[PDB]
């Protein structure tokens, strides 16, 4: 309903559970603006909106943030042929 | 300090447990800083969780809010009504049920209302657990059954009958002056026969301790009690012989008390003997002598009393009749705006 | 075609699944708006109204009959979505209320009574409609003095529409006539009880009439022995009304009547026994003893149809006054009266079934006639009746038809129940439906979950919340929403701090069954439990130990206290409870020597009650995980020998669990090993054993220096496919190896 | 507890723990990937400042955020506890990690007076470009501490609040340290979202009571604690190099009045270069020439004030 | 006051990982696993090493890094407790502490390498492959360990003891490790040939790739694999076809029949090509020298279908492959240029120079692309050698760019490497073109050095 709703906020919620902290207008606005939904049903209650938002985000992820530790031997990778800025490396010094 | 904290308290209130809400309301009511914003939300919380809340807290909140916020106290009492009735009925602790009936009676008296379902149970348990009650307790119970327009014949009759003039320190008592009158007024509010000996016994020993507005109320009650109860006639004679009444007549200073005394005495017909004249005259003197416009209850009581005195042809005292007529003239003049 | 269904629903009949299909009939246009509104009413109960129906209702505001107005109001008040509200917004309370009293006032009474429906969980039209209807009511009732008619209309308007003026006026009008016979007295008493109002002159006028009625009935003690049935029937009706109402003026009469009947139980008619019993329930009377039973034991068939309801309501409450024989004969009487015409209203037979079910297994199975009657007219059953049925259905086995009917109306029964009744109904069905666990109990569970997670801001009591959670957990409908929302709703300072020994154990066992631990909430729960740990009875220690261990919390003090408390209370636990407690403690590994030592003795002594021999090996295994030395005192040896004697019930998994404990602790039990070997041989004979079991059996056999040539011959071939590195060999390499040998 | 408390034996196997840790990802200091730089003077460092800045702008874009590039001049003073066992030599990587955990640096943005000889009165004048500024604009700058986070407010001299928004969060902070001249500090800052209710609330209630010369805090105690107020004199200049690149130079002479710590006591004067990086700049359009341009301009400005920085005002024993 | 049981959490997370990597990998399960794992914490409990590498393996699988507390408490206790880690747990730990950028995730690897070197002799077939595949990821540089492990591989494979799936793992790991040995790869090839027909195509292609990527100068194995690839060409998809194209190009020998059947395979799989491996199937052709135009037209036709989403390096590779015998299909070329302008994101300096050079030498000049590339050229010219600097300068000149801010850095760089700038004969002609445009006025020192 306002500008404090942001894709970053509605992602830090989705990844945290707790998606039910947003009231009905907040989730309706999120579906209308960011999710490009035609028009959310005003009759819809909290749970249906939460389910729709979670489904939209799940389809939105469209990538894998999991680095596999297995060794799949059917992977044909022909592609292959430091300053310490982006964080504070733990256990240093 | 409380003034600075209150804007925060109006935002922290919805998450306040009842035990702490009691202290909050006590603090904000002792210093006259209670508002219509904290009280509404705290009563909303205490009404929402009436399913399982310490009845002590509900009664405390209702009583504390009764004085300044009668509607919220009524809502709180209604919310925990049936649980309170069950506590009054099935409990075994005599002291707890005594305190509960007493303070719920105080709540009902303060808000001048009470649901009948709770009143039946409080009446039944008060009748059952009669002997332990100090005459103050019975007076408070009958007070609660008054000012609430609830009629319970069996309770009235049984409590009055068991009220055998066993007030503390028999033949000399001051506290019963604040209690006995109430009972009479209750018996005056409805119409029950069989309390003439009661008022006679009460007034024969309390005439030397009753003072001020109390007498007037009693007097008026007796007048109405004269409609169905003849034996109250000696008690009225006690009301016409009270030393405190005479000493107030000498220095009539309270206009409401004087107005009600006149209202009682006009229907008492006491305008024939010299002492009656010496009682009536200073009251009418001080009614007009005190400046300012008379207050509404004073206006009505004085108007009715002077109407009854003027219509009474037996008052041949020319000075008293002229005094009554000029009192009526002052009443008309101050009331013409 | 729809009008028949509308009338059936108005009577309170349930509509068969085929009837809704038949009434769909492609509800197109070219039909009057009244039929469309009736169809909307019909579809309101069954799901949500289709979009075509709501659109045709909205667009066809041409002219609507008062029957259509009733249908529109019912549809608005019944639907959960609120679909009618937009169009209802334009025509709130039928803002085209130009229709005067020309419509017969019975239709106005229907309009009044449809408003009594509780609203679904912008409103200014209510006051306008109610005040207009009050004016109309005053006008219509002014030109009449029919006491039954006046009382009936006041009861029809008993709802919050008149500001204590119509009633007061009606009571004054009734008392004005001064001809108040016993019939009018009873009708006026019924009306004045329904409105829960007291009018002092009215009670004053009615007091002598009931005085003379009770005086005649009490005179019928010895004199006036000539019985008049109408007299006793009227006295019983007065007794029932007074018991329900508890008037403070009509209490000498009630006390005198109870005194008369109590000390003079000689030949009083049966028609007085039920109603007086209600007067016995009120006012704290133990005189209900030796009145029902002693005077009414097997001869209550003489009671009239209307008097059966009072007896049913008497029996339902105060379960101490209902016995086995009374329940059986009452159910037989109800079944007998059911078949004929003028049958009883559904509430009475429903209460009869409740009384039948409360007993448990002391009776047989409930007659299918009563259940077939109850499932029909299902909408006519009240709310408290529904709650009682749901609570009691789990106390008697061999009941599935009634339960299948019960858990079908919950989506329709959502908005008609208070929160406490909702919790009670769901917790009650959360045993029979749990035993079912079918597919039909999935749509209903999900719909109830959605409804109770939407309006979750109204549940203000901890016990209701927790019993709701427990009921939804014991239904195999495990979501995240219904537990996430109610985990915080259970954490507010007003909602919290009201929990004690319940709504904590229930909450823990409803979290520790779907694995939704909340760290802070559980920390607070465990702090509370550790605080008031001296007063948790059995059925809590189990319900909280099996809950806080399916979420894997290693609270040292909490476990060390709950173990000791369950050690002190050992007899109360049943055998299956003891096994589950040991399994719960052993799952994590939280050793407790005192608990196991004081608990395995009970299972050893009551060894013969175990369902088969698998559970004994389960006890031994989950007693080993607790690092309790199974080589200790003979108590473990008794269960081991018991397994030995009947070592034919062991299956693959049981042998697998037993081999590990035998091998790891260095247990030299030879007979147990030989029994394992023989049972494994016969299992392989039945071709129902797994290679891992064979490998473990051979392992334990070899480890203990036992030959047992019978098993090695027909088990090893199975037992090497698990432990043989089949290095893949090509066909050329295979033929080369064949050349080698 | 009651019901069938002896049939607790059936439990569906497809139950995996689903702990909820609400309140985890939220906050102001826990919303963006940050970056740190310890670039030391005396080329090839404007390549680190290119790569890190480009990746930070790309991250700001992918999170649907916008920010601005803020550069200023001052003097770092690292806390004495950064070194250990009194060793004057340390790896440039170990130091960059030492400063990134505790942030034990004190930052003082200031420049000596009489340094406006070069700016606006040299070839820097053209560099400063058009002085579109409307002259000194008397303004008070304050910051408020909420229950959770902090807000920053700018109040005009005679009127209600003119700006109220959330605190700054700077993704990339670079300490481009010099030897004798004033050090140059580079930043890529962004604004966390702010609730319209909060801005309208702090607009409705007046913040301070500047009656006569003295000022006092009249903020209601139910909203925050006034921790820093300073009278500001502000001037502005703008440049447009045919690329929408609005490298704005701004001078502010702030006089701290409402003080919390002894660090901010005396009157200070600070220059500042700025740009604007919207949610579309990191897409297609080059967003590295802005960083390098600001770096070169800041280096030149630092060089032009080298001599007078170590004059009677201040001293630098950088050896 | 409430500590989750780490062992049971591990046994739960293993099931969660199996579900996540077998069911498809919906993010809801990943979020649930991360939620449960974050609150997990090793404490005064006494977890065994077997059930600590699991809390680390699953965590790192689900995205956990040194940021979390679980990892920081699991990477530790591996520095202090090293005896507990046996050769079964070692591969899991080593492949876990490989993507982790911490500085204990590199002391752990070295401490484990000091253990696997001593025990590189006492290892069976499976554990050697597991340890080698684990140490391949970390990019460690311990040659004694690799020599010992190669010795153990040869000893174990003297008698057939490797199935036809560990050969792929071992060859891939050593090739990615950049370890050139003729003995070990000869033994692996011998063992692979021993298990005839057990190496299916899906297991054959990666072996060819791994052998081709190691730099083994020899005609033996490249001759042997030819018939196997020729027979297996029937049942392989586009990705493996392109990868084998690149591998056979990098081996450096020309096989007529194999390449012919590969073209006949590709023409049947033209539809599937997604242009991420069209780059390889074109660059292999360019590198080997084969210039058969039958499939060039089909690749050009398929390049239109996917032009909007060519990768950045893909444009460079494809266009420089369109240099040799470029058929000048401007229909695709103009859109490729426009996309290259739009894809002007992070690129490769070599990629930039090759892109510009291929754009200029084909004589199909365009404006927007040239502007974008010239703008980007400044940030990368400081990392160019003399030859590529010359190529970039000529490409700029053919683009007719006179912006001083663009040409000053490249001129400074080319003056810095003047001796190498002038000493390349193959660019001498190009020199006579660059000064053909700029004239003696531009960079007088450069002209003075050029005249001499």
PDB file of C-alpha atoms in Angstrom, chain C residues 586-686:
ATOM      1  CA  UNK C 586      15.530 -43.186  23.460  1.00  0.00           C
ATOM      2  CA  UNK C 587      15.108 -41.365  20.150  1.00  0.00           C
ATOM      3  CA  UNK C 588      17.388 -38.510  21.218  1.00  0.00           C
ATOM      4  CA  UNK C 589      19.609 -40.579  23.485  1.00  0.00           C
ATOM      5  CA  UNK C 590      18.806 -38.752  26.729  1.00  0.00           C
ATOM      6  CA  UNK C 591      19.782 -41.411  29.258  1.00  0.00           C
ATOM      7  CA  UNK C 592      17.747 -41.709  32.460  1.00  0.00           C
ATOM      8  CA  UNK C 593      18.646 -44.768  34.529  1.00  0.00           C
ATOM      9  CA  UNK C 594      15.971 -44.229  37.187  1.00  0.00           C
ATOM     10  CA  UNK C 595      13.160 -43.898  34.641  1.00  0.00           C
ATOM     11  CA  UNK C 596      14.141 -47.031  32.727  1.00  0.00           C
ATOM     12  CA  UNK C 597      14.723 -49.065  35.891  1.00  0.00           C
ATOM     13  CA  UNK C 598      11.321 -48.072  37.295  1.00  0.00           C
ATOM     14  CA  UNK C 599       9.611 -48.469  33.905  1.00  0.00           C
ATOM     15  CA  UNK C 600      10.840 -51.766  32.448  1.00  0.00           C
ATOM     16  CA  UNK C 601       9.587 -53.659  35.509  1.00  0.00           C
ATOM     17  CA  UNK C 602       6.017 -52.703  34.616  1.00  0.00           C
ATOM     18  CA  UNK C 603       6.399 -53.992  31.056  1.00  0.00           C
ATOM     19  CA  UNK C 604       8.052 -57.178  32.323  1.00  0.00           C
ATOM     20  CA  UNK C 605       5.263 -57.908  34.811  1.00  0.00           C
ATOM     21  CA  UNK C 606       2.525 -57.160  32.249  1.00  0.00           C
ATOM     22  CA  UNK C 607       4.445 -58.880  29.464  1.00  0.00           C
ATOM     23  CA  UNK C 608       1.582 -61.050  28.193  1.00  0.00           C
ATOM     24  CA  UNK C 609      -0.521 -58.064  27.060  1.00  0.00           C
ATOM     25  CA  UNK C 610       1.795 -56.993  24.228  1.00  0.00           C
ATOM     26  CA  UNK C 611       0.113 -57.367  20.851  1.00  0.00           C
ATOM     27  CA  UNK C 612       2.924 -59.563  19.507  1.00  0.00           C
ATOM     28  CA  UNK C 613       6.662 -60.171  19.891  1.00  0.00           C
ATOM     29  CA  UNK C 614       7.815 -57.227  17.756  1.00  0.00           C
ATOM     30  CA  UNK C 615       6.973 -54.746  20.508  1.00  0.00           C
ATOM     31  CA  UNK C 616       9.234 -56.567  22.966  1.00  0.00           C
ATOM     32  CA  UNK C 617      12.206 -56.131  20.641  1.00  0.00           C
ATOM     33  CA  UNK C 618      11.155 -52.501  20.183  1.00  0.00           C
ATOM     34  CA  UNK C 619      11.260 -52.038  23.956  1.00  0.00           C
ATOM     35  CA  UNK C 620      14.679 -53.692  24.161  1.00  0.00           C
ATOM     36  CA  UNK C 621      16.098 -51.624  21.288  1.00  0.00           C
ATOM     37  CA  UNK C 622      14.786 -48.284  22.545  1.00  0.00           C
ATOM     38  CA  UNK C 623      16.005 -49.244  26.008  1.00  0.00           C
ATOM     39  CA  UNK C 624      19.490 -49.822  24.592  1.00  0.00           C
ATOM     40  CA  UNK C 625      19.634 -46.439  22.838  1.00  0.00           C
ATOM     41  CA  UNK C 626      19.309 -44.811  26.253  1.00  0.00           C
ATOM     42  CA  UNK C 627      22.669 -46.426  27.131  1.00  0.00           C
ATOM     43  CA  UNK C 628      20.943 -48.698  29.647  1.00  0.00           C
ATOM     44  CA  UNK C 629      22.912 -51.936  29.910  1.00  0.00           C
ATOM     45  CA  UNK C 630      20.581 -54.676  28.669  1.00  0.00           C
ATOM     46  CA  UNK C 631      22.941 -57.219  30.253  1.00  0.00           C
ATOM     47  CA  UNK C 632      21.585 -56.059  33.643  1.00  0.00           C
ATOM     48  CA  UNK C 633      18.939 -57.550  35.945  1.00  0.00           C
ATOM     49  CA  UNK C 634      16.643 -60.266  34.612  1.00  0.00           C
ATOM     50  CA  UNK C 635      13.869 -57.827  33.647  1.00  0.00           C
ATOM     51  CA  UNK C 636      15.306 -57.478  30.146  1.00  0.00           C
ATOM     52  CA  UNK C 637      15.931 -61.228  30.109  1.00  0.00           C
ATOM     53  CA  UNK C 638      12.223 -61.908  30.661  1.00  0.00           C
ATOM     54  CA  UNK C 639      11.301 -60.003  27.502  1.00  0.00           C
ATOM     55  CA  UNK C 640      14.168 -61.659  25.627  1.00  0.00           C
ATOM     56  CA  UNK C 641      12.929 -65.115  26.636  1.00  0.00           C
ATOM     57  CA  UNK C 642       9.369 -64.119  25.754  1.00  0.00           C
ATOM     58  CA  UNK C 643      10.599 -63.251  22.264  1.00  0.00           C
ATOM     59  CA  UNK C 644      12.397 -66.605  22.206  1.00  0.00           C
ATOM     60  CA  UNK C 645       9.299 -68.642  23.058  1.00  0.00           C
ATOM     61  CA  UNK C 646       7.126 -67.105  20.324  1.00  0.00           C
ATOM     62  CA  UNK C 647       9.827 -66.186  17.819  1.00  0.00           C
ATOM     63  CA  UNK C 648       7.485 -66.668  14.871  1.00  0.00           C
ATOM     64  CA  UNK C 649       5.937 -63.182  14.899  1.00  0.00           C
ATOM     65  CA  UNK C 650       9.299 -61.500  14.275  1.00  0.00           C
ATOM     66  CA  UNK C 651       9.577 -59.883  10.856  1.00  0.00           C
ATOM     67  CA  UNK C 652      12.512 -58.535   8.854  1.00  0.00           C
ATOM     68  CA  UNK C 653      12.646 -55.145  10.578  1.00  0.00           C
ATOM     69  CA  UNK C 654      12.400 -56.688  14.049  1.00  0.00           C
ATOM     70  CA  UNK C 655      15.311 -59.043  13.377  1.00  0.00           C
ATOM     71  CA  UNK C 656      17.265 -56.140  11.915  1.00  0.00           C
ATOM     72  CA  UNK C 657      16.754 -54.120  15.083  1.00  0.00           C
ATOM     73  CA  UNK C 658      17.605 -57.103  17.297  1.00  0.00           C
ATOM     74  CA  UNK C 659      20.859 -57.992  15.531  1.00  0.00           C
ATOM     75  CA  UNK C 660      22.321 -54.533  16.182  1.00  0.00           C
ATOM     76  CA  UNK C 661      21.634 -54.622  19.917  1.00  0.00           C
ATOM     77  CA  UNK C 662      22.896 -58.206  20.183  1.00  0.00           C
ATOM     78  CA  UNK C 663      26.139 -57.379  18.380  1.00  0.00           C
ATOM     79  CA  UNK C 664      26.998 -53.989  19.877  1.00  0.00           C
ATOM     80  CA  UNK C 665      26.651 -54.724  23.598  1.00  0.00           C
ATOM     81  CA  UNK C 666      28.411 -58.136  23.480  1.00  0.00           C
ATOM     82  CA  UNK C 667      25.398 -60.171  24.572  1.00  0.00           C
ATOM     83  CA  UNK C 668      26.151 -63.904  24.662  1.00  0.00           C
ATOM     84  CA  UNK C 669      22.490 -64.965  24.407  1.00  0.00           C
ATOM     85  CA  UNK C 670      22.636 -68.203  22.396  1.00  0.00           C
ATOM     86  CA  UNK C 671      18.949 -69.294  22.404  1.00  0.00           C
ATOM     87  CA  UNK C 672      17.924 -65.894  21.062  1.00  0.00           C
ATOM     88  CA  UNK C 673      20.476 -66.244  18.257  1.00  0.00           C
ATOM     89  CA  UNK C 674      19.220 -69.723  17.372  1.00  0.00           C
ATOM     90  CA  UNK C 675      15.641 -68.429  17.328  1.00  0.00           C
ATOM     91  CA  UNK C 676      16.754 -65.599  15.039  1.00  0.00           C
ATOM     92  CA  UNK C 677      18.412 -68.141  12.749  1.00  0.00           C
ATOM     93  CA  UNK C 678      15.383 -70.438  12.539  1.00  0.00           C
ATOM     94  CA  UNK C 679      12.951 -67.563  11.997  1.00  0.00           C
ATOM     95  CA  UNK C 680      15.208 -66.128   9.292  1.00  0.00           C
ATOM     96  CA  UNK C 681      15.279 -69.539   7.613  1.00  0.00           C
ATOM     97  CA  UNK C 682      11.494 -69.738   7.529  1.00  0.00           C
ATOM     98  CA  UNK C 683      11.246 -66.097   6.401  1.00  0.00           C
ATOM     99  CA  UNK C 684      13.497 -66.872   3.445  1.00  0.00           C
ATOM    100  CA  UNK C 685      11.331 -69.932   2.865  1.00  0.00           C
ATOM    101  CA  UNK C 686       8.389 -67.565   2.472  1.00  0.00           C
TER     102      UNK C 686
END
